[model samples]
Target: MGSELETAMETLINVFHAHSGKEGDKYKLSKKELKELLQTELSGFLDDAVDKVMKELDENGDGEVDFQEYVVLVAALTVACNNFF
Candidate 1:
């Protein structure tokens, strides 16, 4: 039993895991894995929708990704996809 937001967040987590791959091994997305992950997972999903949104979400410019940023990204995409659907 999850709330709407919780369900949305779970969907986001699943997408993250899908791109990141297994829970162990090099597939784990640390704070330093945004560029490659975005390059791979975001092509069809974003396709230049927002300029440097990936970078903006990268925040600290440390070249990695945070789970919080990932959630925001998924939430944004979720809404847009809903509209499209």
Candidate 2:
């Protein structure tokens, strides 16, 4: 293991691609794939909430999450966390 930040960054990339490559565009996550990714990879996470959140992340109004969109998901989580402090 490395530093916390490094490990977290690595995990972020790995988690995204793991689901993204499952179907459709290998560089992006389809709606179903993203749903499964959230349900399995994220503990206590609701598919319903993910659907709503994914709706927000898909800025171009496309139906899937590209790398940039995935990063936006992470960024949004951080922003929300910062607001809690």
Candidate that would win on lDDT: 2
For candidate 1, the TM-score is: 0.50
TM-score of each: 0.50, 0.78
lDDT of 1 by residue, 9-58 (tens): 68767767765554333334553244456666666744453346656676
lDDT of 1 at 24: 36
Candidate 2's displacement at residue 6, Å, is 2.0
Model 1: how far is 79 from its true place, Å? 0.5
Segments of candidate 2 deviating more than 4 angstroms: 1-3, 79-85
* Clash pairs detected, candidate 2: none
* Candidate closest to the true structure, highest TM-score: 2
